[PDB]
Every structure is written in C-alpha cells, then in structure tokens.
Design a protein around this ligand. Structure first.
Ligand SMILES: CN[C@@H](C)c1ccc(F)cc1
Ligand SMILES: CN[C@@H](C)c1ccc(F)cc1
Length: 460
C-alpha cells in the first residue's frame, strides 16, 4: 500500500456563542453554503485530516468529540481516530484523521497561549496542535483574538504573542517560532477583525451584503488592510473571500445582522464583519492549494456562522537509504556562494548563521560574517565563500530536492536570533550555481534578507 504524495485537510472555525450546536452540522464538513464550495460529487470522499477550531465552546471535550465523530461517520461511513484535542477556557482544537493514517502520524504536540495582562487575561488566546505526517510537519493554530472594532492593534499584539510563545513542533529548532517550524502551518479562528466603516453606514452595509456585493466591504476589512501594511500575518496566505460576513447574526435565522449597541455588547456596535478566518503558510515550493473557503447557511445556534476551508497539501515519505538515517551520504552536499544577510538592526555585533534541516544530522554553525555599511544605512553581513559545506544524510535527489534549510542569523555577543528564514532545495538544476533568497523575520516581523547562490550535489 503506497505512501501518499498528497493529502486533503479540512479546517473549520466556529465561534459557537456559548450555545450547543443544532442536531445536524454536516454542511460544515461538506464545505456547503456560501463562498468557494466543494463539488457535490466529492461528498462521500473523506478528507485525510479534519481540524476543528471552536471559540465560545460550551461543550465538554467528550460531548464535542461524540458530535464530530458521529457527523463524519454519517458523511463518510469512516470512524475517524482522535489525533489530539486541546482546550483553553472555551477555545478548543480537535484533530481527527482517517484510521489508515494512525501509523503515519507521530510527534503529536499541543500547547496554548493566554493573551493580555490582568483585565485582558482570562478568556482570549490560542490553542494549537502539531505532528509529523510521514516526512511532513503540520501545525495548526486556533486563536480567539481581542474583540471590538477599535482594537485592531490589540489583535495584532495578540497575534505576535501567540506566534512567539506557542510551543509546538521540533524543540531542537530553538531559534525558530511556529511560523518556521512546519512544512504547512494553518492559522484560523475568530480573529475578530472588523469591517472599518462608520456606524451610520450599517444599513448600507446590510444592503450591500443582500446584493452579494462584498468589494467595498472587503476594501475596509481590518485583516486585509493590516496584512497589506505588513502589520500582522506577514508571509501568510488567505483565499479570496466570496461569502457574506459571518458575524453578527441574530440566532435561529441568517436573515438578520444584529449590529446595534446593547448593554449585552458593552454598548459597542458590531457592524457585519468577517471575524472568522483561515490563513496558511507553507515552505517555499511545497504544493498547497485551497479547494474551498466559505461559510455554512444552515447552522444558526450562534451569532457567528461556521467557516470551512479545505486544502490539497504536498507530503513526503519517511525516507530510508543504506546510509542515512544514522550516517551521512558522501554523494550529497549543499554549498553556498556569494551569500550575505541585510539586517535592519542599528546594532554592531559580529553575526554567524545556523543551518537547521531534517536532512542534516544536527544543525550547522557558520563562522562570523564580515560587517559592511550598506549605501542606505543598513547592516550587510558578508559570508562570501566562507559558509560551511552541508552534509545531508541522504543524497537521493527524490529526497533531497524536497527538503528545506532554515537559516537563523545570530549575534556572537548574545547568541540571540536577529532573523529567521527558509530556503527550498527544489532547484531548477543540480551541480549548478543558482540564486537563493529568503526574507528574514524575528517574532514574525521583517528584520532583513538573506541572498546568495546555492550549489546542490545529489547522487544523480
Ligand atoms: C499513538 N498516539 C495516538 C494518540 C494517535 C492517534 C491517532 C493517530 F493518527 C496517530 C496517533
Ligand atoms: C501576502 N500577499 C500579499 C500580496 C497580500 C497582502 C494583503 C492582502 F490583502 C492580499 C495579499
């Protein structure tokens, strides 16, 4: 029975509004309703992995697991295995997989982050799960960010705290946060970004939604505008939104947006908004295609509608050769020519590089680079031809061309990372000098760039 080179992943996000769900929620798992929906001809085809994020979830883990499993069983006639479940307050993540994947899934991690201080610590934050699927690392984050139209900066701060402190994936990847630890990272939840239009325009917005004319609303969506200005979710992708705003509905219908200020809202307006979102980030030149992104129309227990997204994702096999794992393959090497880092830092320490990859026995430390002043005020760290030759565990090109090298640039003085990035080994040619590039981030903010040339030798 051959190992897969693709899997499909279902991502669901639903703020349940502290109410139990209705008896049928199958439309969510089938990607049916509004937006980019799944073809009817696929209804019996199970996804390989289902990841369910809830917020304001009033159910026990047991109660929710029973509803989810019985839902998937009805759709697919498959009894799904529970990979992981993790809850922080009323924020929950469930990962379910087809039973045939049980012995493909390992290194299962869960964590949570509580956002805010004092006043603002006690119900917002994130949960996450990571695991390996054969040779591919998968991470999943469900976050409930700060509410309120005038708190987009707080949401952006919540995002930075979550990606700094959520402890998922391979702990040996010590310089890297969750935005570099996974082949594929999915980040979803009630992110709570709003449509920033005046309160007086509420009925105009409702009109626009009834016409299915979303363009003038999306141009004021705080998550789209913050992402454009590089304030949040740098280097993440989101599928185009073609469904109505998922918040705030009167319960038991979808015919009415409840936007007016009430004692129950803290006298805040809730203009119709796309609070409920799915984003992703995959390593360079790995296959990932969004195949659905939408909301259900028939689940009306909450003031939010459920959101679904599905993805095709490239995966690789757990490779063994006569040499690696447990030794190098002298027939393989990775060389770096004319490399330099450009950093936004005002500091003057020496810097060195660390190379981390599951194609190496352990990470590799470079010598210090030579600092020069760039012509526009920047720090340029030149490595020239001085970077070590990397010795992969397996030289087979069917393995090596599917790998990635994570790069951290670190201060000699403090050993703290100033910048992290990733290079694909999916090259146009082997034994050939080719340009490489990655942006560098730290705490998920742009800090610089790394560029140069690579030369990859495989056994072929
Ligand atoms: C051995 N660990 C259990 C939790 C497990 C369950 C499902 C799966 F796909 C992989 C592992
Ligand atoms: C990450 N891709 C960039 C081009 C982008 C930024 C904001 C946005 F709303 C859509 C795309």
């Amino acid at each position: 029975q051959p190992e897969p080179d693709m899997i499909t992943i279902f991502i669901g996000t639903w703020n349940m509004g502290n109410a139990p769900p209705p008896k049928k929620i199958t439309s969510w798992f089938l990607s049916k309703g509004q937006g980019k929906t799944r073809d009817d001809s696929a209804d019996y085809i199970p996804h390989d992995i289902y990841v369910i994020g809830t917020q304001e979830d009033p159910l026990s883990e047991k109660e929710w697991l029973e509803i989810l499993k019985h839902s998937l069983q009805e759709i697919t006639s498959v009894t799904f295995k529970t990979v992981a479940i993790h809850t922080l307050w009323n924020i929950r993540i469930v990962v379910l997989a087809k039973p045939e994947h049980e012995n493909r899934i390992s290194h299962i991690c869960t964590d949570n982050v509580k956002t805010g201080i004092a006043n603002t610590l006690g119900n917002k934050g994130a949960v996450g799960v990571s695991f390996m699927f054969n040779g591919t690392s998968l991470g999943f984050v469900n976050s409930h960010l700060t509410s309120g139209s005038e708190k987009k900066l707080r949401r952006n701060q919540n995002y930075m705290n979550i990606l700094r402190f959520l402890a998922l994936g391979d702990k040996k990847l010590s310089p890297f946060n969750i935005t570099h630890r996974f082949t594929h990272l999915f980040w979803f939840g009630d992110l709570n970004y709003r449509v920033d239009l005046p309160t007086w325009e509420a009925e105009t917005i409702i009109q626009k939604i009834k016409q299915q004319q979303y363009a003038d609303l999306l141009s004021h969506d705080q998550l789209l505008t913050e992402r454009r200005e590089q304030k949040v979710f740098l280097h993440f992708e989101e599928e185009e939104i073609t469904f109505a705003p998922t918040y705030r509905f009167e319960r038991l219908t979808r015919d009415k947006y409840a936007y007016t200020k009430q004692k129950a809202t803290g006298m805040k307006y809730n203009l119709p908004s796309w609070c409920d979102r799915v984003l992703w980030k995959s390593y360079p030149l790995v296959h990932v295609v969004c195949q659905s992104y939408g909301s259900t129309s028939d689940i009306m227990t909450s003031d939010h509608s459920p959101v679904f997204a599905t993805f095709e994702a490239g995966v690789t096999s757990q490779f063994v050769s006569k040499n690696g794992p447990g030794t190098v393959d002298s027939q393989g090497q990775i060389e770096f020519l004319r490399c330099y880092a450009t950093l936004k830092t005002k500091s003057q320490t020496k810097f060195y590089l660390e190379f981390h990859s599951s194609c190496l026995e352990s990470f590799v430390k470079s010598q210090e680079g030579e600092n020069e002043e760039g012509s526009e005020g920047e720090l340029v760290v030149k490595f020239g031809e001085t970077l070590p030759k990397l010795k992969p565990i397996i030289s087979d090109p069917e393995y090596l061309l599917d790998q990635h090298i994570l790069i951290s640039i670190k201060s000699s003085d403090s050993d703290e990372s100033y910048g992290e990035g990733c290079i694909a080994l999916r090259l146009e040619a082997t034994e050939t000098q080719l340009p490489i590039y990655t942006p560098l981030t730290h705490h998920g903010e742009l800090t610089g760039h790394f560029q140069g040339e690579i030369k990859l030798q495989t056994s072929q």
